[PDB]
């Protein structure tokens, strides 16, 4: 569960699964090859600030 130290941009959400009781999304990362795709839980993809701003703007 160790994170890459960097910050990255989601290009596409490709697939969904459940691992150990947690939903994960297969992410294609912008600027990176398809071989770099990773499975991530929601918390890695979405901050609380993201959720609130998205809500307040809708």
């Amino acid at each position: 569960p160790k994170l890459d130290e960097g910050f990255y941009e989601i290009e596409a959400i490709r697939r969904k699964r459940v691992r150990k009781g947690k939903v994960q999304y297969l992410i294609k990362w912008r600027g990176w090859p398809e071989t770099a795709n990773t499975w991530e839980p929601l918390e890695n993809l979405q901050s609380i600030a993201d959720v609130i701003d998205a809500f307040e703007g809708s």
Binding site: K2, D4, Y8, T38, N44
Partner: peptide, 8 residues
């Protein structure tokens, strides 16, 4: 977004 480092 944050990313998980690959398995080694």
């Amino acid at each position: 977004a944050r990313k998980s480092a690959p398995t080694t």
